[PDB]
Design a binder for this molecule. Sequence first.
Ligand code: NA
Ligand code: NA
Ligand SMILES: [Pt+2]
Ligand SMILES: [Pt+2]
Ligand SMILES: [Pt+2]
Ligand SMILES: [Pt+2]
Lengths: 251, 251
Amino acid sequence: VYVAVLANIAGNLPALTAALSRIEEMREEGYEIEKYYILGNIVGLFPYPKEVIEVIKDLTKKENVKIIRGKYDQIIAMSDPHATDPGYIDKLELPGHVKKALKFTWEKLGHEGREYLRDLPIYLVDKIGGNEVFGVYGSPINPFDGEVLAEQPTSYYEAIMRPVKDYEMLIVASPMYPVDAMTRYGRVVCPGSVGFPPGKEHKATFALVDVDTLKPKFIEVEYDKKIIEERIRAEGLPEEIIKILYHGGRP
Amino acid sequence: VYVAVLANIAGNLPALTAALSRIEEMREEGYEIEKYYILGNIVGLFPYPKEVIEVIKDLTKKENVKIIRGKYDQIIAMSDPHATDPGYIDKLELPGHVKKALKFTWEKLGHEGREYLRDLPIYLVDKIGGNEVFGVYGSPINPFDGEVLAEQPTSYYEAIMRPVKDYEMLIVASPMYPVDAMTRYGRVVCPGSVGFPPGKEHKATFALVDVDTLKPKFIEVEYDKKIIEERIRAEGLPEEIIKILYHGGRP
Ligand code: NA
Ligand code: NA
Ligand SMILES: [Pt+2]
Ligand SMILES: [Pt+2]
Ligand SMILES: [Pt+2]
Ligand SMILES: [Pt+2]
């Protein structure tokens, strides 16, 4: 019995599709999936924002699913609901290629898609087994702009867990790699990144968390970067997004 | 029955003492007070940081109390746990008089006081009645630097409640004045300020939240500012803290 924990889809439909199909295969292999946690970014740099949302909505009907929004989702959601274009984004402190990806996302979502992100919770507060879990995109101190690093010593995660020590587990998206850090205050976990490559040769990465022990099993799944590349060019988006696709980046 | 909700003690012992004494008096008059929520800032501008913590500690032994830290508390907690002086504060984006108050608080607390603040939660998550409640110092988007304003239209509070709509009530400290705004997503409440005067002729302000209806009753209690003025001068702190005591300010 496990909870499937996914993060940072970032508008990448092929990676999301590959992760969920792998989860279905693993069900056939004796892994019982009680429920799903999906952490932002939900939409972002990659050009399938409406399709990602459709897949999540179907899953939310069929399964027990809890979702929280990430930094890119918030940039879209915070906009005036009556705005006629995504011009407000150019004022923000962001790289040029990121502004263009988010303006594209804003337009392609329409009013219904923007509204869906506005309904997304910031915080995940849940129980698995007898254990209480707290989830946030960035860090406890700063939900959208906070950054928890991967590959740090136990003391690092202990200091982060301390202000949320009421909980048995903290889940964050911002490390972008698998994190599994037992501390005196609880366990800090990052499932990895489904659709936002942090480096080269990225595989869609997520975790199955054991409901009894809270130990994560990290899973990696290949997806086709070819159709994504061809979809970016066909929508007229910066060449820098293709670089991130094959070389990595930080949101 | 009621929950006593208090915020922004900010190191002001006489104001905290007067509010708690009024709560005890209202219980003598036949008010059922079952628990306490205490929101930051716990310490800050006023020169009674150690004593405020002793009153809270004693109250936590005898009553059902949930506490969260505020901006000023976080600035102290953030610091390297065996730094020798509060020199790090001089590099922060804070007015001169605020820097001096916080350096004094850092020293007066000692290691044991600094560690007490490091143990305080960021988030309040609770049930009262069958109603879920979420509390944070600043705002849901930004726990320490976020600001929810008083005296805005209903639509302003609705957009703030929307990302925490899974809850029946949001409690924030940052307005500094009583707020009680029903929205379609839940009720946004600020209890007022116990020890940080927002303007002139300040009384210690807090709320009793009806457990059934979630309607706040705002209570104002008088306290002595002259003894505080005397302690500020005796301890060498800036004249601007005295100006805040009598004419108000913002953290
Ligand atoms: Na814990
Ligand atoms: Na609600
Ligand atoms: Pt904005
Ligand atoms: Pt272990
Ligand atoms: Pt710091
Ligand atoms: Pt209501």
